[PDB]
Design a protein around this motif. Structure first.
Motif, short mmCIF file in Angstrom:
data_model
loop_
_atom_site.label_atom_id
_atom_site.label_comp_id
_atom_site.label_asym_id
_atom_site.label_seq_id
_atom_site.Cartn_x
_atom_site.Cartn_y
_atom_site.Cartn_z
N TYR A 75 0.80 -1.22 0.00
CA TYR A 75 0.00 0.00 0.00
C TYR A 75 0.84 1.27 0.00
O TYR A 75 0.48 2.24 -0.67
CB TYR A 75 -0.94 0.01 1.21
CG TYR A 75 -2.17 -0.85 1.02
CD1 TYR A 75 -3.27 -0.36 0.34
CD2 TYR A 75 -2.21 -2.15 1.51
CE1 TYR A 75 -4.39 -1.15 0.16
CE2 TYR A 75 -3.33 -2.94 1.33
CZ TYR A 75 -4.42 -2.43 0.66
OH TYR A 75 -5.53 -3.21 0.48
N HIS A 106 -1.26 6.67 -4.89
CA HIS A 106 -2.18 7.22 -3.91
C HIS A 106 -3.60 7.26 -4.47
O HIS A 106 -3.84 7.03 -5.66
CB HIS A 106 -1.74 8.62 -3.48
CG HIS A 106 -0.30 8.70 -3.10
ND1 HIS A 106 0.20 8.16 -1.94
CD2 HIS A 106 0.76 9.28 -3.72
CE1 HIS A 106 1.50 8.39 -1.86
NE2 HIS A 106 1.86 9.07 -2.93
N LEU A 107 -4.56 7.52 -3.57
CA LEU A 107 -5.96 7.79 -3.91
C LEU A 107 -6.65 6.54 -4.45
O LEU A 107 -7.87 6.53 -4.64
CB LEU A 107 -6.03 8.96 -4.90
CG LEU A 107 -7.35 9.62 -5.32
CD1 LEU A 107 -7.07 11.07 -5.66
CD2 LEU A 107 -7.96 8.94 -6.53
N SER A 134 -5.15 3.32 -3.07
CA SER A 134 -4.89 2.42 -1.95
C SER A 134 -5.83 2.66 -0.78
O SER A 134 -6.02 1.76 0.04
CB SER A 134 -3.44 2.56 -1.49
OG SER A 134 -2.54 2.25 -2.54
N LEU A 135 -6.43 3.85 -0.69
CA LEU A 135 -7.34 4.13 0.41
C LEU A 135 -8.60 3.27 0.32
O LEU A 135 -9.03 2.68 1.32
CB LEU A 135 -7.71 5.62 0.42
CG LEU A 135 -6.66 6.57 0.99
CD1 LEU A 135 -7.15 8.01 0.92
CD2 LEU A 135 -6.32 6.19 2.42
N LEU A 138 -12.18 12.20 -1.75
CA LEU A 138 -10.92 11.89 -2.41
C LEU A 138 -10.38 13.05 -3.24
O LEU A 138 -9.23 13.00 -3.67
CB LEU A 138 -11.09 10.66 -3.30
CG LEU A 138 -11.35 9.34 -2.58
CD1 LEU A 138 -11.76 8.26 -3.56
CD2 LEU A 138 -10.14 8.91 -1.78
N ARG A 197 -1.18 17.15 -3.88
CA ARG A 197 -1.11 15.94 -3.09
C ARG A 197 -2.47 15.71 -2.43
O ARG A 197 -3.05 16.65 -1.87
CB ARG A 197 -0.02 16.04 -2.02
CG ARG A 197 1.38 15.90 -2.55
CD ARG A 197 2.30 15.34 -1.48
NE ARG A 197 1.80 14.06 -0.98
CZ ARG A 197 2.57 13.05 -0.60
NH1 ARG A 197 3.89 13.13 -0.66
NH2 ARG A 197 2.00 11.94 -0.15
N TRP A 229 -4.70 10.96 2.14
CA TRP A 229 -3.54 10.07 2.24
C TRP A 229 -2.52 10.61 3.23
O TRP A 229 -1.98 9.86 4.06
CB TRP A 229 -2.90 9.89 0.87
CG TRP A 229 -1.75 8.94 0.91
CD1 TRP A 229 -0.43 9.25 1.07
CD2 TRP A 229 -1.81 7.51 0.82
NE1 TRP A 229 0.33 8.11 1.08
CE2 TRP A 229 -0.49 7.03 0.92
CE3 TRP A 229 -2.86 6.60 0.65
CZ2 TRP A 229 -0.20 5.67 0.86
CZ3 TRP A 229 -2.56 5.26 0.59
CH2 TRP A 229 -1.24 4.80 0.69
N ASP A 230 -2.24 11.91 3.16
CA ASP A 230 -1.32 12.53 4.10
C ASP A 230 -1.86 12.45 5.52
O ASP A 230 -1.11 12.17 6.47
CB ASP A 230 -1.06 13.98 3.71
CG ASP A 230 -0.26 14.10 2.42
OD1 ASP A 230 0.54 13.19 2.13
OD2 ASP A 230 -0.44 15.10 1.70
N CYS A 289 -1.34 8.82 6.75
CA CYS A 289 0.05 8.52 7.08
C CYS A 289 0.47 9.20 8.37
O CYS A 289 1.11 8.59 9.24
CB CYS A 289 0.97 8.93 5.93
SG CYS A 289 0.89 7.85 4.49
N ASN A 320 7.00 7.91 2.16
CA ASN A 320 5.79 7.99 1.35
C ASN A 320 4.97 9.25 1.57
O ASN A 320 4.20 9.62 0.69
CB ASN A 320 4.90 6.77 1.60
CG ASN A 320 4.19 6.30 0.35
OD1 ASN A 320 4.71 6.43 -0.76
ND2 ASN A 320 2.99 5.76 0.52
N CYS A 321 5.11 9.90 2.72
CA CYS A 321 4.35 11.10 3.05
C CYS A 321 5.32 12.28 3.05
O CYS A 321 5.94 12.59 4.06
CB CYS A 321 3.64 10.95 4.39
SG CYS A 321 2.28 12.11 4.64
#
Ligand SMILES: [Mg+2]
Ligand SMILES: [Zn+2]
Length: 1432
Positions: free
Chosen positions: A1190, A1195-1196, A1198-1199, A1216, A1337, A1341-1342, A1345, A1398-1399
């Motif tokens: 993951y 991104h976007l 895997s959530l 999203l 970004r 996701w941020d 993380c 990743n972040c």
RNA sequence: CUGUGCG
């Protein structure tokens, strides 16, 4: 000989076929004899490194060893006489010359010395060659190893080993080289510091023996406890007798509150012809004291236009250099004038004008008359020049139109080149009408004439009207400070002083436009004039622009600081009626020190701390009042003194007795307001002179000043040094006709004997303790390594220390900067004494646990109201001595330890013979003053010394003396000496009286806590206690420790290392922390600035600063960022925090809270998924199939997969789309994985790799220092420049990215109430036009993380629902009601670092080691108004 | 050669 053949085959096989190297290879192959074979191998290796360095950096090898002048004359350039310098590499290209001298050094000290030497030589050569008009940029290639491209690693190592063995064999066979050169080459080829002195020949002559004899003669360190006690008792009896009879004067007085107030009130009774000022009269005088103060409190009362649009556009395009920087300026002035004419004809505008002058580009005020005269001259000139060829109608109007259109077209073409289109500047092209030249020449304006009054020979408005209770004055000061600071950004171009062109900064106040006019550019003090278009020349002053940063956006912060301070002393019954005045006075003081930042005002405010410390005490030094009075010059400084006196007399009245802790806190914060004034030097030369006189005068009083000593010490100088060493120990006291002479440097033989004996017999302990040219041609032959050493130092020379100053609040501190070899030599002493003091206890300098023990002990002492004695020591640096430490160490008794003590004695004797270099600026100023005096009445002592040396030839360059330790150099040694001497002093006091004292010392500061017996002796026997205090002072004096006049004896407050403790209440230095957060702004990347501000505010919240003031400070920082127009992403600062955000959480938690605040129900589903995920990974499963399945994917997407894996409701399509703009998506901002970058930068930094990089980047910044305001203007300039780097290394403006975003209509911005920007990016447009979408970004996701990182670092409680606090109901809002709080403190490290790579939003795992606060003191109301986060 | 920005 088999190894010889193997080496020859290896070098013949694995050497590069370079034609340069072919000659040396042929020379090496033919060699038979080991000596010449060795020499040729050394030459071959040197040539290998030289060629590799030349080719790596792109330069031509200098095999002929031609000098620079020879090469220049060969290449066709004539040069004058030059210094003999042979560059290893050289290359010419265009007008750029590169010299690339290369060296290899295995040792760090040798590397640093050689790099500095080569840099100085290249600077000298460049300065000499500057007359040739050829650019020369120094390039130095230093390597810490022999590895390079010509020879592989293992072959190079084997060749080095065999060649070194060959040299050993040759030395033991024929001994061709000297012992010195042989040892040098062996040490340079073989590739801690305590045993580094083993390889040096010992040349310690009889001078060292004589010094040791001097430090041993007359000293008895074998005394038993009985004899020491008897001597102490006899000494105390004699001291009692002589103090009673008056032969010895007392240095302390009982604290009299009325007498202290009277002494404070008459501190300046020679020009202040009053002692009780009316507060209303003080307000009247304050609102009219100075032109700035007059402007702040006067009645200055009264849709963007085309002029501003065109001015901004032409300001941007003038940097592109479309081009002769005289004609485009005229064209720009004409264009801006046309825009102004258009505005005035369309809607009757008046902005941008100052009478007959208008504001053009580059902040310039430009006269209309001169503009039109230049325009007509230019148009007519080109008319008469062009028409001399053909026959056509010129039509001046059309000529100007054509020139305008060509310039505008070129500017548009250059602007679109970076990605900016002119319609984003909102400029209208209809301002250029066919009737343009006639319109601009038939334009008349009549108004005021802007002037600057450079002299002080009335005010246009009413000088009163703005109330102190409101924030209008702070807002006006904020705008004026911003204008003053921005006045330093103007680029360098070229009495009533009415001028035709000047520079102006525009600011709006109360709906009216004002112009700050100046006639000089740069970061220097200059004359400013505040002007207005209604009435010209409002006022004039002489401010220094780089001293006006702290108030730029701090109106709310300062108003709330004043309100908090007033709320402290608010429930006092005696201060109820006199409560407004206090507020006014407080406000006034702050405003003054912000309007006129003066060093004298800073000192005056700082001395109030010592005054208030003495006021609440029992005994104080008799000389305190004299030390509290420093010279005041300007009228505003005397007004500040009068305001402070009025405030003190109101607060510290005899009739006021209710809440003394609150009033003490208020007065201490008033004193600490001095931190609001910047600590930067007002005048560097004056501070250098003051530093040198402070360094020199005590040495002249002692009588030992060695002027310009040679590296080899003269016999007479050695004799004088020994004489002064003996004199330092020949201090008498209490047993002589004259008695003791206080504050004279030196120690007594009797008391040194007693202290050393007490240490030796354990009385001080506790229960817990008991050919040559060819070698110089080599690039690796070290030449600067010492090989022997005398008593005065190594054979390479005595220790050099350059003298400078470190600026602080309330003056400066001396600073001694030495060579890196000298620093390593001093580190041995420092480490030994640090360990030695670490064995003992009570030293709070380097230990953190001992400081906590001291804090607890002070709290306990104050709680029981025992006697606390807070001491500073005067002149701790200059008066202390390396010989004193040597004499102490030679008598202390604790195989190879004898050798260790001998090495310590040798190093201390080296520090004895140190040479301190007089600053060159000081010497130049003294020469100029001496010339003016002798050719063209004070004649200070330093001036007399300089004049005497000048009249006799030799100019002083270096000073050697016995009476000086490096300020901070022998710092741990001084701490150890203070520790042992104070242990002895307390032991003697216990031997005299019935009580005992517990002391904590940090190297110049001390807190002594008296047990119950001494306190009772204070109440029931004042004379005995006073005699004990005087005996403590005398004993300290006998051991070269001089108690400061600012030391206090008292039971109310205990102070140590700038921390104050009283019973019941807390003492937060609120003004100190507020000023620290207002003076903390650098030219770094904005997220680093945000992290620094967050750390400072976390410390402030821990120390007791209320959370709303800290939120206001964060808002101020974001306002500063917004002025530079940097976008405020949700990862900078959270300005809606509470107590729990700072106590329980961390920076990541605060960012989580900010994101949750931005998007309400979009973080709840993510948090449910995160709770499920954290539970699954806590059970032990899913750990390995998530961090690489993951965090490695896109991104976007895997959530949703994570949500469906855990059986939770996935985020909606609306959720999203939330995104934030990352300007560092492709590369970091040009400010001149992240964790992998940090690891690389830390690994390649010590010596092996990147040492030369660190040294170069440090020496580049060494001779480059600026102010905080300079940092802010640099930050604004950078954020306005091309700082954003694109995916393909291109450079873009921030405005370019924002215009590209504005090109797309799907993306929509959303701004928080505090200015935080986040974007909604529809998912239908994320792959077509990837030019700007790559900068965005996703926000969820941020958030996910950061939430996982915070849950791992702090616990699962962060993943619960953030329910707000309920009603409460009603609790009293007592501002002085503090509550203590403590924060809750391998498999998961891998997952955390996988989250970090990743972040790219926040530095999650690097924040651990960069110290976490271990104690929090908050307000009970603020704590109880915090949110609730409970794991369920 | 690098700012034009008053939350
Ligand atoms: Mg102290
Ligand atoms: Zn207008």
């Amino acid at each position: 000989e088999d190894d010889m053949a193997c080496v020859k085959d290896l070098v013949s096989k694995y050497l590069a076929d370079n034609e340069r190297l072919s000659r040396q290879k042929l020379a090496f192959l033919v060699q038979t004899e080991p000596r010449m074979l060795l020499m040729e191998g050394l030459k071959l290796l040197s040539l290998c490194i030289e060629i590799d360095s030349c080719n790596a950096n792109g330069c031509e090898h200098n095999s002929e060893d031609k000098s620079v002048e020879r090469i220049l004359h060969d290449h066709g350039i004539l040069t004058p006489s030059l210094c003999f310098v042979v560059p290893d590499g050289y290359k010419l290209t265009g007008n750029v010359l590169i010299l690339l001298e290369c060296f290899v050094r295995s040792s760090p000290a040798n590397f640093e010395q050689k790099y500095i030497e080569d840099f100085k030589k290249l600077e000298q050569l460049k300065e000499d060659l500057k007359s040739v008009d050829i650019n020369l940029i120094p390039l130095i290639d230093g390597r810490t190893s022999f590895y390079n491209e010509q020879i592989p690693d293992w072959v190079n190592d084997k060749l080095r080993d065999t060649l070194f063995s060959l040299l050993r064999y040759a030395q033991e066979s024929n001994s061709l080289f000297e012992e010195s050169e042989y040892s040098r080459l062996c040490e340079s080829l073989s590739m801690s510091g305590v045993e580094s002195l083993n390889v040096l020949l010992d040349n310690r002559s009889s001078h060292y023996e004589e010094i040791i004899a001097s430090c041993h003669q007359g000293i008895n360190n074998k005394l038993t406890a009985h004899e020491v006690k008897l001597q102490i008792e006899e000494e105390y009896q004699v001291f009692r007798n002589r103090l009673r009879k008056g032969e010895i004067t007392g240095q302390f007085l009982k604290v009299d509150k009325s007498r202290l107030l009277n002494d404070f009130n008459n501190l300046y009774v020679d020009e202040v012809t009053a002692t009780k000022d009316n507060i209303e009269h003080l307000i009247y005088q304050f609102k009219r004291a100075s032109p700035i103060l007059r402007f702040l409190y006067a009645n200055i009362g009264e849709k963007e236009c085309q002029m501003q649009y065109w001015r901004s556009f032409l300001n941007k395009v003038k940097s592109l250099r479309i081009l002769t920087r005289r004609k485009l300026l005229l064209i720009f002035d004409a264009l801006i004038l046309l825009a102004s004419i258009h505005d005035q004809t369309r809607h009757k505008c008046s902005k941008g004008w100052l009478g007959s002058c208008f504001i053009s580009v580059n902040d310039r005020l430009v006269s209309l008359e001169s503009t039109k005269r230049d325009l007509e001259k230019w148009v007519g000139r080109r008319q008469q020049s062009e028409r001399s060829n053909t026959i056509q109608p010129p039509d001046k109007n059309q000529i100007l139109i054509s020139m305008f259109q060509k310039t505008i077209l070129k500017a548009t073409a250059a602007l679109k080149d970076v990605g900016i289109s002119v319609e984003h500047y909102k400029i209208n092209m209809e301002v250029i009408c066919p009737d343009s030249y006639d319109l601009i020449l038939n334009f008349d304006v009549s108004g005021v004439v802007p002037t600057i009054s450079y002299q002080r020979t009335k005010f246009p408005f009413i000088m009163g009207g703005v109330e102190l209770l409101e924030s209008t004055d702070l807002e006006r000061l904020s705008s004026l400070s911003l204008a003053l600071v921005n006045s330093m950004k103007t680029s360098s171009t070229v009495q009533v002083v009415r001028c035709k062109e000047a520079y102006c900064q525009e600011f709006l106040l109360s709906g009216a436009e004002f112009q700050l006019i100046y006639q000089k550019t740069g970061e220097c003090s200059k004359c400013y004039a505040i002007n207005d278009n209604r009435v010209g020349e409002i006022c004039s002053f002489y401010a220094d622009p780089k001293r006006y940063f702290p108030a730029i956006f701090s109106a709310e912060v300062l108003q709330t600081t004043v309100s908090t301070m007033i709320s402290w002393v608010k429930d006092c019954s005696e201060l109820e009626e006199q409560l407004c005045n206090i507020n006014s006075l407080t406000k006034m003081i702050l405003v003054l020190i912000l309007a006129h930042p003066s060093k004298r005002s800073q000192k005056l405010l700082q001395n109030l701390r010592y005054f208030i410390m003495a006021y609440v005490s029992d005994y104080h030094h008799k000389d305190l009042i004299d030390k509290l009075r420093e010279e005041l010059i300007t009228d505003v400084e005397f007004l500040l003194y009068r305001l402070v006196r009025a405030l003190v007399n109101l607060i510290l009245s005899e009739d006021v007795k209710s809440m003394m802790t609150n009033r003490f806190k208020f007065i201490l914060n008033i004193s600490y307001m001095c931190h609001f004034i910047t600590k930067e030097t007002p005048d560097r030369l004056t501070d250098q002179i003051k530093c040198f006189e402070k360094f020199l005068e005590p040495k002249l009083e002692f009588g030992h000043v060695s002027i310009n000593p040679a590296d080899v010490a003269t016999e007479e100088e050695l004799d004088d040094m020994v004489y002064n060493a003996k004199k330092f120990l020949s201090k008498e006291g209490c047993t002589s006709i004259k008695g003791p002479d206080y504050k004279k440097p030196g120690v007594s033989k009797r008391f040194l004997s007693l202290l050393t004996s007490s240490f030796n017999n354990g009385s001080l302990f506790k229960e817990s303790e008991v050919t040559t040219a060819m070698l110089k041609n080599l690039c690796f032959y070290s030449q600067e390594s010492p090989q022997s050493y005398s008593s005065t130092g190594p054979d390479t020379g005595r220790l050099k220390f350059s003298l400078s100053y470190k600026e602080q609040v309330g003056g400066n501190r001396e600073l001694y900067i030495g060579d890196l070899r000298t620093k390593m030599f001093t580190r041995l002493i420092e480490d030994y004494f640090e360990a030695l003091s670490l064995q003992l206890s009570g030293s709070c300098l380097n230990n953190e646990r001992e400081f906590e023990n001291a804090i607890l002990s002070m709290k306990l002492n104050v709680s029981l109201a025992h006697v606390s004695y807070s001491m500073d020591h005067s002149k701790w640096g200059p008066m202390m001595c390396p010989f004193l430490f040597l004499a102490t160490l030679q008598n202390l008794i604790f195989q190879a330890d004898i050798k260790g003590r001998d090495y310590l004695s040798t190093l201390l004797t080296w520090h004895m013979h140190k040479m301190v270099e007089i600053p060159f600026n000081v010497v130049s100023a003294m020469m100029k003053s001496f010339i003016k005096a002798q050719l063209g009445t004070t004649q200070s002592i330093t001036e007399d010394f300089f004049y005497s040396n000048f009249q006799i030839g030799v100019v002083p360059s270096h000073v050697s003396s016995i009476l000086d330790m490096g300020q901070g150099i022998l710092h741990n040694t001084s701490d150890f000496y203070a520790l042992i001497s104070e242990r002895f002093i307390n032991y003697a006091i216990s031997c005299i009286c019935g009580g005992t004292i517990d002391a904590y010392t940090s190297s110049d500061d001390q807190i002594s806590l008296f047990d119950q017996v001494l306190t009772e002796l204070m109440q029931r026997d004042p004379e005995e206690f006073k005699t004990l205090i005087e005996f403590h002072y005398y004993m300290s004096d006998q051991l070269n420790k001089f108690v400061s006049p600012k030391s206090v004896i008292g039971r109310f407050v205990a102070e140590f290392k700038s921390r104050f403790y009283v019973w019941g209440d807390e003492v937060p230095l609120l003004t100190k922390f507020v000023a620290a957060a207002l003076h903390n702004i650098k030219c770094k990347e904005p997220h680093q600035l945000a992290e620094t501000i967050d750390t400072i505010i976390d410390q402030s919240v821990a120390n007791g600063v209320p959370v709303h003031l800290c939120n206001l400070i964060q808002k101020r920082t974001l306002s500063l960022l917004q002025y530079a127009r940097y976008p405020i992403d949700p990862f900078l600062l959270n300005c809606e925090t509470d107590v729990r955000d700072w106590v329980d959480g961390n920076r990541s938690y605060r960012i989580m809270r900010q994101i949750e605040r931005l998007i309400p129900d979009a973080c709840g589903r993510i948090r449910s998924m995160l709770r499920k995920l954290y539970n699954k990974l806590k059970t032990g499963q899913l750990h390995e199939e998530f961090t690489t399945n993951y965090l490695s994917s896109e991104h976007l997407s895997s959530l949703s997969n994570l949500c469906e894996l855990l059986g939770v409701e996935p985020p909606s399509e609306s959720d999203l789309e939330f995104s934030w703009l990352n300007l560092a998506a492709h590369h970091p901002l040009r400010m001149v994985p992240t964790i992998v970058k940090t690891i690389q930068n830390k690994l390649s930094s010590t010596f092996t790799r990147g040492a030369q990089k660190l040294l170069s980047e440090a020496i580049n910044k060494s001779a480059f220092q600026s102010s905080i305001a300079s940092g802010f203007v640099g930050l604004c300039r950078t954020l306005g420049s091309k700082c954003v780097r694109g995916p393909n290394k291109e450079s873009l403006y921030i405005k370019s990215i924002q215009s590209l975003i504005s090109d797309i209509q799907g993306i929509e911005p959303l701004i928080d109430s505090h200015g935080v920007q986040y974007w909604r990016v529809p998912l239908n447009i994320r792959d077509g036009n990837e030019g700007v979408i790559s900068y965005f970004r996703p926000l969820l996701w941020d958030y996910m993380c950061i939430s996982l990182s915070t849950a791992i670092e702090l616990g699962a409680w962060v993943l619960g629902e953030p329910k707000k606090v309920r009603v409460l109901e009603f609790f009293k809002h007592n501002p002085c009601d503090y509550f203590p709080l403590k924060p809750a403190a391998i498999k998961f490290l891998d997952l955390c670092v996988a989250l970090d790579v990743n972040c790219e939003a926040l530095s999650l795992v690097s924040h651990i080691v960069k110290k976490r606060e271990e104690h929090y003191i908050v307000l009970s109301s603020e704590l109880r108004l915090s949110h609730t986060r409970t794991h369920e």
